[PDB]
Design a protein around this nucleic acid. Structure first.
Ligand SMILES: [Mg+2]
Ligand SMILES: [Mg+2]
Ligand SMILES: [Mg+2]
Ligand SMILES: [Mg+2]
Ligand SMILES: [Mg+2]
Ligand SMILES: [Mg+2]
Ligand SMILES: [Mg+2]
Ligand SMILES: [Mg+2]
Ligand SMILES: [Mg+2]
Ligand SMILES: [Mg+2]
Ligand SMILES: [Mg+2]
Ligand SMILES: [Mg+2]
Ligand SMILES: [Mg+2]
Ligand SMILES: [Mg+2]
Ligand SMILES: [Mg+2]
Ligand SMILES: [Mg+2]
Ligand SMILES: [Mg+2]
Ligand SMILES: [Mg+2]
Ligand SMILES: [Mg+2]
Ligand SMILES: [Mg+2]
Ligand SMILES: [Mg+2]
Ligand SMILES: [Mg+2]
Ligand SMILES: [Mg+2]
Ligand SMILES: [Mg+2]
Ligand SMILES: [Mg+2]
Ligand SMILES: [Mg+2]
Ligand SMILES: [Mg+2]
Ligand SMILES: [Mg+2]
Ligand SMILES: [Mg+2]
Ligand SMILES: [Mg+2]
Ligand SMILES: [Mg+2]
Ligand SMILES: [Mg+2]
Ligand SMILES: [Mg+2]
Ligand SMILES: [Mg+2]
Ligand SMILES: [Mg+2]
Ligand SMILES: [Mg+2]
Ligand SMILES: [Mg+2]
Ligand SMILES: [Mg+2]
Ligand SMILES: [Mg+2]
Ligand SMILES: [Mg+2]
Ligand SMILES: [Mg+2]
Ligand SMILES: [Zn+2]
Lengths: 60, 97, 116, 23, 155, 83, 127, 97
RNA sequence: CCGGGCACUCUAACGGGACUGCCCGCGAAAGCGGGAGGAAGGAGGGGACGACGUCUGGUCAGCAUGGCCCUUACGGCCUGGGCGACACACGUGCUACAAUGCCCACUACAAAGCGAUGCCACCCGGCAACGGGGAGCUAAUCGCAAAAAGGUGGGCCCAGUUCGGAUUGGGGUCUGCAACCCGACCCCAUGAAGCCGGAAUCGCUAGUAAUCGCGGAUCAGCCAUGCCGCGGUGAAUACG
């Protein structure tokens, strides 16, 4: 049960609470950042390829 | 006390008692068996019986495998005995000046 | 059995002493001494007898205490245990009541560990 | 100490306010 | 450690007597980095030994320090199949460390209620020949004399 | 507990079948999944079946169980002890 | 006329202004002894001029920002040691050997993932 | 007469703040130099691994750099060659008064 | 605060700076020890960075994908329950057992972040959580904001206590369609165990450990005492 779950998260819900975020890239339900709309795994995948504008590896 | 984990596998309370009775061979050496932990598992060729035990003189870690689950259990105790008897007597070697 | 049925300690201040009563905490200690105009820092050994029954009177007439309070708390636990609601079940078994996990801890409600 | 709600230090620990830690 | 002998940190002298040894004692009093508290306890004690003994606190402090310094100690070394408590001399660095350590520890064993009081009285008794601090220095010395026979095992 | 500014919550679909029974000479047995609904006084005297996830439990409402929820009286976990 | 140094320590930055005078010292709109009232470490903030005898010879205008009291205090020590050298170049010797001229680089080490603090490691059962 | 510039890369941001300062400077008259506002840092810390391994992370940042310029003596002669402003893609300009 | 200014602090982009370069000495050499200068000295402190490979290590449940298996069901929607159970057992943590402490009142000193059905000044109601008004801020401007330890003053007087704050009764707040199972917070009352912990065992070499608070992601709310960060105060010791 994932594809139906990916579609049911898009569908506006019968109540405002039932809304939750998924990963727009892989459908992952957990650890979804709202800034990117991505999960932690896709966040690191796109950032490593340079396809996140501005996002760079941070060291200090 | 002694803990038993059946990873990705179901066992009975009888099986768990056999394990406790088999680990009881280690009581021979009259040393504290501190939080002993057995892990029974199932691999494509047979069963694996893991164990981690701490004693006042060191730790015991050993893994036993065999098609028959009880044999893998027994092979584990054999490997654990040889380690315990090494922990209990290795210090006696360097005794003479 | 001075006030109120509890022989509160002398040697100690009045606000501190009145806490040694079922139903009176730090909060209600401030309320009793203001409403009767008693220095809250006076030792019980130093209360003028006029002050005592002045303090005694207000305390016993205002709030439920000791036995009446305890009978009431019990009566509420009793009615919960009679009407068969979920909280009542938790009091029936001696298990915790406010949703806490019971897989570990809960030693206050369960008591010291029973071996197996 | 920090685990006591009815004190200042307890309300600091929880990040809350009230009669024992006003704002 | 394995590679080199470590370097002994230099302490800053203390802004009330200029002594580095006074500083080291403050640090040993310190708990949870509360140095302001730690300094106040020593100076408060410094006044108390003034009130009860009319002479220089600093003098009282350094005399009690010398009294608790262990000159010899036992240090275990297993030989064959027995642990032999070998008698070794204490380096001046280690003497100082053990004295200040035992001074505080024996002080906080006292029954007196305020830390500044416990620190004061222990230093007064240790300036003389009394106190559980001096007892420790003497016990350690006694046990090293007890085992003078194993003094050839030294390293 | 629920804010007093808000109302005493009943799922409205349970409240309705209460009054139609009241206004006609009740009672029929009420089956419901409204564990969240409060036991308002109009319910006093009825017997209502509460779903606990498995069974609808017949719960006879009395006078002293009013400021409560229906779930409190159809507990969900079967437990009889250990050993 | 007026003399200035820049003093920094941990997260504190102190700007100090040395004008000649009887000795009065003010830190951020307060007297010295009032700002550090009840702090034993304060007197160390005036040590550079006690080393070049300018103890009562100067008044002190001092601002302070960031960090905490003791960091601010050590910042002062560098600041007024900075000012005395521009006040007189030969003040370096008999002030530099007292270390008062160097800037203390020791600062908070960053928290790292996997640890509880900079280095404090989580507890585990190797057994 | 205010212009503020925001960008994710500071190399393009500074170049795009020079080609504005330079622009209306000679174009008459006064230009208050490019002032670097403090940078807003937006941090991202994730577990390197797709499954467990909780104690291994990788840090990412997304820095939103900021610049301010005051074209002090406006003169609508300047308010023209600024309409055709060849600024790179990474930066965003705001114009207020 | 205005006039005025960019000195200073700062903010943030670009540079310079440290190389055993200089000196003394050992050395064939590479280097080593000591010295000066210097903000910094011998990788200056920390970060990012992890070789050929190992563990038939981990993940078909993030994703991808070979092959096998299901096809009014091993697919899909809902409501309710469960994932929170509790004779027990282990791992990680929080708060403690008190006077270097606890409480109350007054008074200081940060950093990094976040913030337009967001952050909320200030006023009013409520003991309070909070509620009603309402300004400001597309935010170096307005706001979260008070930092806490500390400092000052006062109380407590060694007691299971003015230590500790578990457990439970009662009364409220708020989010949310909905807080029974199963939310956080406030208020009254209750006030447990615990008097420093057996065998055993963990961390840490300097701005470290210890201790003190602050922020963020996730997020309606929150079971965070978690995690990733931030600064305050600030040790002990290393013979080997
Ligand atoms: Mg299904
Ligand atoms: Mg799929
Ligand atoms: Mg949600
Ligand atoms: Mg989500
Ligand atoms: Mg088991
Ligand atoms: Mg055998
Ligand atoms: Mg009481
Ligand atoms: Mg709960
Ligand atoms: Mg604490
Ligand atoms: Mg308390
Ligand atoms: Mg000690
Ligand atoms: Mg001792
Ligand atoms: Mg800085
Ligand atoms: Mg002073
Ligand atoms: Mg820190
Ligand atoms: Mg681990
Ligand atoms: Mg962890
Ligand atoms: Mg300039
Ligand atoms: Mg060298
Ligand atoms: Mg490299
Ligand atoms: Mg897959
Ligand atoms: Mg597959
Ligand atoms: Mg095929
Ligand atoms: Mg559903
Ligand atoms: Mg559920
Ligand atoms: Mg779970
Ligand atoms: Mg539960
Ligand atoms: Mg068991
Ligand atoms: Mg925890
Ligand atoms: Mg702790
Ligand atoms: Mg006691
Ligand atoms: Mg008690
Ligand atoms: Mg007891
Ligand atoms: Mg108490
Ligand atoms: Mg309640
Ligand atoms: Mg709930
Ligand atoms: Mg302690
Ligand atoms: Mg031991
Ligand atoms: Mg190291
Ligand atoms: Mg926090
Ligand atoms: Mg939230
Ligand atoms: Zn994803």
């Amino acid at each position: 049960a994932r594809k139906a779950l990916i579609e049911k998260a898009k569908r506006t819900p019968k109540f405002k609470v039932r809304a939750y975020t998924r990963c727009v890239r892989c459908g992952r339900a957990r650890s979804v950042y709202r800034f990117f709309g991505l999960c932690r795994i896709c966040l690191r995948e796109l950032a490593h390829k340079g396809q996140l504008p501005g996002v760079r590896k941070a060291s200090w | 006390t002694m803990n038993i984990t059946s990873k990705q596998m179901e066992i009975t309370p009888a099986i768990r008692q056999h394990v406790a009775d088999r680990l009881a061979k280690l009581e021979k050496w009259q040393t504290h068996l501190i939080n002993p932990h057995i892990i029974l598992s199932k691999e494509p060729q047979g069963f694996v019986a893991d164990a981690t035990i701490n004693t006042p003189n060191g730790v015991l870690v050993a893994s036993g495998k065999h098609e028959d689950m009880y044999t893998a259990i027994n092979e584990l105790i054999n490997k654990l005995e040889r380690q315990l008897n090494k922990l209990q007597h290795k210090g006696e070697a360097r005794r003479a000046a | 059995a001075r006030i109120a049925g509890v022989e509160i300690p002398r040697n100690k201040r009045v606000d501190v002493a009145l806490t040694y009563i079922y139903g009176i905490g730090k909060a209600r200690a401030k309320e009793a001494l203001e409403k009767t105009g008693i220095n809250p820092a006076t030792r019980v050994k130093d209360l003028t007898e006029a002050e005592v029954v002045r303090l005694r009177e207000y305390v016993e007439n205002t709030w439920k205490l000791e036995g009446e309070l305890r009978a009431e708390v019990a009566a509420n636990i009793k009615r919960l245990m009679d009407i068969g609601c979920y909280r009542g079940l938790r009091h029936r078994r001696g298990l915790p009541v406010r949703g806490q996990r019971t897989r570990t801890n809960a030693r206050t409600r369960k008591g010291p560990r029973k071996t197996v | 100490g920090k685990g006591d709600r009815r004190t200042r230090r307890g309300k600091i620990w929880r990040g809350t306010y009230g009669k024992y830690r006003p704002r | 450690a394995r590679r080199r002998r470590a370097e002994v940190r230099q302490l800053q002298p203390d802004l009330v007597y200029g002594d580095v040894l006074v500083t080291a004692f403050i640090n040993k009093i310190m708990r949870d980095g509360k140095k302001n508290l730690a300094a106040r306890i020593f100076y408060d004690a410094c006044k108390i030994i003034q009130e009860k003994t009319g002479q220089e606190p600093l003098k009282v402090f350094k005399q009690a320090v010398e009294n608790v310094k262990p000159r010899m100690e036992v240090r275990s070394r297993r030989v064959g199949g027995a642990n032999y408590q070998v008698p070794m001399e204490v380096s001046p660095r280690r003497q100082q460390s053990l004295a200040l350590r035992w001074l505080v520890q024996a002080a906080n064993q006292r029954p007196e209620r305020r830390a500044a009081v416990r620190i004061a009285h222990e230093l007064m008794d240790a300036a003389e020949g009394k106190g559980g601090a001096v007892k420790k220095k003497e016990d350690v010395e006694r046990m090293a004399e007890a085992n003078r026979a194993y003094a050839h095992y030294r390293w | 507990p629920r804010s007093l500014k808000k109302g005493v919550f009943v799922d409205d679909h349970l409240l309705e079948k209460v009054l139609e029974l009241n206004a006609k000479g009740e009672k029929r047995l009420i089956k419901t999944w409204s564990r969240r609904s409060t036991i308002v006084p109009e319910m006093v005297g009825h017997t209502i079946a509460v779903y606990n996830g498995k069974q609808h439990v017949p719960v006879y409402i009395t006078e002293n169980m009013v400021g409560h929820k229906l779930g409190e009286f159809a507990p969900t976990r079967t437990y009889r002890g250990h050993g | 006329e007026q003399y200035y140094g820049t003093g920094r320590r941990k997260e504190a930055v102190a700007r100090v202004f040395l004008r000649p005078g009887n000795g009065k010292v003010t830190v951020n709109g307060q007297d010295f002894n009032e700002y550090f009232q009840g702090l034993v470490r304060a007197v160390a903030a005036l040590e550079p001029l006690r080393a070049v005898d300018a103890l009562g010879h100067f008044d002190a205008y001092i601002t302070v920002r960031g960090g905490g009291k003791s960091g601010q205090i050590d910042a002062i020590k560098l600041g007024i040691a900075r000012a005395l050298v521009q006040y007189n170049p030969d003040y370096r010797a008999k002030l530099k050997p007292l270390g008062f001229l160097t800037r203390d680089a020791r600062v908070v080490e960053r928290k790292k993932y996997g640890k509880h603090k900079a280095r404090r490691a989580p507890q585990y059962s190797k057994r | 007469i205010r212009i503020k510039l925001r960008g994710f890369d500071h190399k393009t941001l500074d170049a795009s703040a020079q080609k504005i300062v330079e622009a209306a400077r000679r174009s008459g008259a006064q230009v208050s130099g490019p002032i670097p506002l403090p940078t807003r840092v937006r941090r991202f810390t994730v577990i390197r691994g797709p499954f467990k391994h909780k104690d291994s992370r990788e840090h990412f940042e997304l820095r939103t750099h900021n610049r301010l310029v005051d074209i002090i003596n406006p003169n609508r002669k300047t308010i023209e060659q600024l309409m055709t402003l060849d600024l790179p893609t990474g930066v965003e300009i705001e114009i207020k008064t």
